[PDB]
Design a protein around this ligand. Structure first.
Ligand SMILES: CCCCCCSC1=C(C)[C@](O)(/C=C/C(C)=C\C(=O)O)C(C)(C)CC1=O
Length: 175
């Protein structure tokens, strides 16, 4: 369940525009994709909701935002992760929200974990071939490379699961 040459071709321009980074030495990047057999805007409605990432993020326990919270670039959230993980909390600034083009992204700017300078971008993309509408989501990130330990593996495993749960959650709401 990875993207076909055609989906790849269609998404080539989105990758160039939102998922291409100028790396700092000592940093790395990753790109993940997820087909979702559901409508784009449904997917998009969950992805944009920067105050409720628990809706589709596997390992989030709770997420609080400030009083009278309004969703704008520069606003933060404090995420608490579930028990038994090697992280407790994360605090995150929304770096992008384009409802027109369906692009968000955020940076992890503190918390009790070991990701250093993590920033990701998430984009939702509509597909159609004779009466079948479906969605592909792309998510990329940049982080610092890490004696101990193993932040890339953590990041890849977490985004992959979140993308699988996103799909599961949105395909249900397509009820
Ligand atoms: C080793 C089994 C995979 C679990 C390790 C991931 S625990 C974890 C989790 C679940 C995180 O939310 C990571 C989230 C990430 C990388 C992406 C995202 O949430 O979109 C942080 C608290 C920010 C960093 C972190 O360490």
């Amino acid at each position: 369940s990875e993207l076909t040459p055609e989906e790849r071709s269609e998404l080539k321009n989105s990758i160039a525009e939102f998922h291409t980074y100028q790396l700092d030495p000592g940093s790395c990047s990753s790109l993940h994709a997820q087909r979702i057999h559901a409508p784009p805007e449904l997917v998009w409605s969950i992805v944009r909701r920067f105050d409720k990432p628990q809706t589709y993020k596997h390992f989030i326990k709770s997420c609080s935002v400030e009083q009278n919270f309004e969703m704008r670039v520069g606003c933060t959230r404090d995420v608490i992760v579930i028990s038994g993980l090697p992280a407790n909390t994360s605090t995150e600034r929304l770096d992008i929200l384009d409802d027109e083009r369906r692009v968000t992204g955020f940076s992890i700017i503190g918390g009790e974990h070991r990701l250093t300078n993590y920033k990701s971008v998430t984009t939702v993309h509509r597909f159609e071939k004779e009466n079948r509408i479906w969605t592909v989501v792309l998510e990329s990130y940049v982080v610092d490379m890490p004696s101990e330990d193993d932040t890339r593996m953590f990041a890849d495993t977490v985004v992959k699961l979140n993308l699988q749960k996103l799909a599961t959650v949105a395909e249900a709401m397509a009820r």
